[PDB]
Amino acid sequence: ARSAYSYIRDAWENPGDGQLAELQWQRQQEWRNEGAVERIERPTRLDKARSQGYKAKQGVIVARVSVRKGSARKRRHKAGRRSKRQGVTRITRRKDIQRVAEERASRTFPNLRVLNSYSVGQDGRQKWHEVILIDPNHPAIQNDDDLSWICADDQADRVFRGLTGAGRRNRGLSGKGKGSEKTRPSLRSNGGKA
Amino acid sequence: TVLHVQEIRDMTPAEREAELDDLKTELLNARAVQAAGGAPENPGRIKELRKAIARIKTIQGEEGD
Amino acid sequence: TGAGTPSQGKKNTTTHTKCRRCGEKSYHTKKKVCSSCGFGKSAKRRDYEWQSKAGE
């Protein structure tokens, strides 16, 4: 039969309709009054969290992060530039907002490692994402068959090197064939043309 | 030289400390005679005294005092 | 008053001093920042790739 989780899932396919609509209208009022990174006891989208690796266990942390909406916040050129490199307004950054959110969260919790993240809406001037972080130093986690992999030394600061799911997608690593000629195995090795 | 490692290990903790203060004093007096430009020196000892003290201090830590 | 010799006589201010962190006489005692190693400005050590030829 349908899991209770599927109901949370199905509700979020249209965050603008039904009860969820009312919840968001109510919630965001409080979120707007919260900081940039607020730790929270429980995921707002349980099905998503569990699906991404979340577990109700010691060493598993969830935090909501908000980031200003829109394109790049760039300063116009103070030195000579050819028309091409004079743009300022319509230029956007190469990292999506979710990635910026994952990094801020990870900065707030220096000892934790980003496991994954997902969206929880936005208003006209900002977007919110909840990030799942794991404590690689807690025994409850060092002994987990599903999460202990994140305790390895080469997993340290994984978010800052683009090793997150959002990181890999944003680096154009989804496709295994056509279109990934310059993304795999890394943007840098391909001369940075991906 | 005159003081060997066995002899030191054979001393009780109290003896090593009494021997330590003794050595420190000879040294201090040598450094005093040196400050006065005194020549009745024997440069080899001023050097031995330091090593002796290092030995006793090394042994003390080893034995747990 | 000329900008040369006559103006050099007024220089009796102490700015750069021996730095606690790196030892170079580059700790600006008025800014409390080392122009050589970055002490007072950054926990990380002051460094730049332009301090050497690009391919070296």
Partner: protein, 81 residues
């Protein structure tokens, strides 16, 4: 562990202080206070220290001028080292 007294400071001026004012002069650890210099001295030569003046020298060391009580005789104390 650093000691307080390094060595006696013996010079013309030091001798005068010793013959005319019952004062002894020492090169001491620059981290030592006047009080710590007083104690150390009383415990090394068994005397009563009345006053201690200090100076951080241009030799990188600290010099102490220790005046003994009228009970003690500097000339004699210094004469046994």
């Amino acid at each position: 562990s650093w000691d307080v007294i390094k060595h006696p400071h013996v010079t013309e001026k030091a001798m005068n202080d010793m013959d005319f004012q019952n004062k002894l002069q020492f090169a001491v650890d620059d981290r030592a206070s006047k009080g710590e210099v007083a104690d150390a001295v009383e415990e090394q030569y068994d005397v009563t220290v009345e006053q201690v003046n200090t100076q951080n020298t241009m030799d990188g060391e600290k010099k102490a001028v220790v005046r003994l009580s009228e009970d003690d005789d500097a000339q004699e104390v210094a004469s046994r080292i």
